[PDB]
Design an enzyme around this catalytic site. Structure first.
Site, PDB file in Angstrom:
ATOM      1  N   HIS A  29      33.170  44.830  30.991  1.00 13.73           N
ATOM      2  CA  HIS A  29      31.868  46.043  31.281  1.00 13.73           C
ATOM      3  C   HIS A  29      32.261  46.098  33.155  1.00 13.73           C
ATOM      4  CE1 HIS A  29      29.053  42.945  32.642  1.00 13.73           C
ATOM      5  NE2 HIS A  29      29.290  44.153  34.043  1.00 13.73           N
ATOM      6  N   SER A  56      28.035  39.304  37.239  1.00  6.37           N
ATOM      7  CA  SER A  56      29.061  39.248  36.181  1.00  6.37           C
ATOM      8  C   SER A  56      30.625  39.515  36.005  1.00  6.37           C
ATOM      9  CB  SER A  56      29.239  40.566  35.330  1.00  6.37           C
ATOM     10  OG  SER A  56      27.450  40.958  35.342  1.00  6.37           O
ATOM     11  N   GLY A  57      31.818  38.775  35.589  1.00  5.47           N
ATOM     12  CA  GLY A  57      32.949  38.172  35.435  1.00  5.47           C
ATOM     13  C   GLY A  57      32.946  37.091  35.895  1.00  5.47           C
TER      14      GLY A  57
END
Lengths: 221, 57
Positions: free
Chosen positions: A42, A177-178
């Site tokens: 995403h 995120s990630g």
């Protein structure tokens, strides 16, 4: 990182910082090869800049290494309703130079259970209504009975990890995120998503599951 | 380029909240799923949104 402390600088030499444009957007990632970053799907974008060697993301240091991602390997199964297969590989335009502040996090030449503690690091927000952290933060979280993520949109204990005690504030939040969930120094999950009100646990991608998709990519490239 | 027909408060920190009449620059409509990646014309924010929820001008 919600409820952590700022890291010892460059103590997490794998920590990648992603700058993604379509507008701009920012994620975390980590370095698994000298030319590969591991992240979440995403975060994908028109083009992405990758900063390595940073602690303070706003202070230009000499440890820094910004590299243009010249390939994006979004998992093909990635689905935006369940956010399953929220994993992506990135081939850097250049093999990075391994120093102290910049280092790869290798994967052993194993399905992980609830119970253990883990750590994730990131420049994400340090609270629901706060800004992203200038400096890299980190926090120790616990692996939970997946019935703790039960009310997450199609939670699958085979594809996803349920990270973070609900009886604490400590959690990974937006922007983190990630970033890698490191269990006893091994990456086992990538921060994917969680609640809007920042209530834990949050959903991490279960690394073990996609390890072959990964092996395949790094080999054919 | 898409508009909102109802007010919406998302559940996932990956998705946008929005009001009726808010408008969106979609970004990544390729992934399989109800949801597209868009950009609020009203807040300037990026995130996923429900495709049965918005409407194009």
């Amino acid at each position: 990182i919600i409820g952590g402390t700022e890291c010892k600088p460059h103590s997490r030499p794998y920590m990648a910082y992603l700058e993604i444009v379509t507008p701009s957007k920012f994620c975390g990632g980590f370095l698994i090869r000298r030319n590969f970053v591991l992240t979440a799907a995403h975060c994908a974008g028109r083009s992405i800049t990758v900063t390595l060697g940073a602690h303070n993301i706003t202070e230009e240091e000499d440890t820094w290494q910004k590299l243009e991602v010249i390939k994006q390997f979004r998992h093909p199964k990635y689905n935006t309703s369940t956010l399953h297969h929220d994993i992506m590989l990135l081939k850097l335009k250049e093999k990075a130079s391994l120093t102290l502040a910049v280092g790869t996090l290798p994967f052993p030449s194993n399905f992980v259970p609830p119970g253990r503690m883990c750590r994730v690091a990131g420049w994400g927000r340090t609270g629901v209504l706060k800004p992203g952290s200038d400096t890299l933060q980190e926090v120790k979280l616990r692996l939970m009975d997946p019935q703790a993520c039960s009310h997450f949109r199609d939670f699958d204990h085979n594809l996803q990890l349920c990270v973070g005690n609900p009886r604490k504030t400590k959690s990974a939040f937006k922007g983190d995120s990630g970033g890698p969930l490191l269990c006893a120094g091994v990456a086992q999950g990538i921060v994917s998503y969680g609640r809007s009100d920042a209530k834990p646990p949050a959903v991490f991608t279960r690394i073990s599951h996609y390890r072959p998709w990964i092996n395949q990519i790094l080999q054919a490239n | 380029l898409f508009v909102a027909l109802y007010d919406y408060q998302a559940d996932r920190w990956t998705d946008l909240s929005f009001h009726k009449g808010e408008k969106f620059q979609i970004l990544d409509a390729s992934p399989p799923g109800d949801w597209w990646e868009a950009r609020s014309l009203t807040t300037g924010e990026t995130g996923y949104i429900p495709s049965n929820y918005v409407a194009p001008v």
